[PDB]
Amino acid sequence: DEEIRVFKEYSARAKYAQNEGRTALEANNVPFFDIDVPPELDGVPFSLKARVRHKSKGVDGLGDYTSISVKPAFYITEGDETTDTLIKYTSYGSTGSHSGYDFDDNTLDVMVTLSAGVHRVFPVETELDYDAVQEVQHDWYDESFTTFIEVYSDDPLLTVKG
Ligand SMILES: [Ca+2]
Ligand SMILES: [Ca+2]
């Protein structure tokens, strides 16, 4: 069995966000999930992933051939869920028009090194595309063309075996 530890699934489009700290993102209703890092993973790098869908064609009335640059990230509290400082994690960028075919879904795949205890994770889109700004007046904290279908880990360090 190739085990998968699911952390969360999201149906809503992820919001554009710069690294403005935990309080700012929560104020703007950026959904999150918490990960409780156990003592045996205290300060130990592990793999965190997301199934990511980019879909731009006609979204908010955007042109079907408009090129949209994307770069999803996790923003994760360095301290616990009550602290503000966030660390940025990215792994890929993509560009051009996006149809959002499930067989084209991308994978954010990062190495995360965290202290023991709870950390809050914000799945976000970090790239605000200028064509989007001009065509459909997208700005920071608007819903982007990026959706975190599922956040997960297939790292044996995190999964329940079976
Ligand atoms: Ca296995
Ligand atoms: Ca563009």
Curated annotation (Swiss-Prot):
Receptor binding protein located at the fivefold vertices. GO terms for cellular component: virion component. The C-terminus is responsible for receptor binding activity. The N-terminus is associated with the capsid vertex. The chain holds residues 165 to 326 of 335 of the full protein. It comes from the Viruses. Signal peptide: none annotated. This is Spike protein P1. It is found in: Virion. Keywords: Virion.
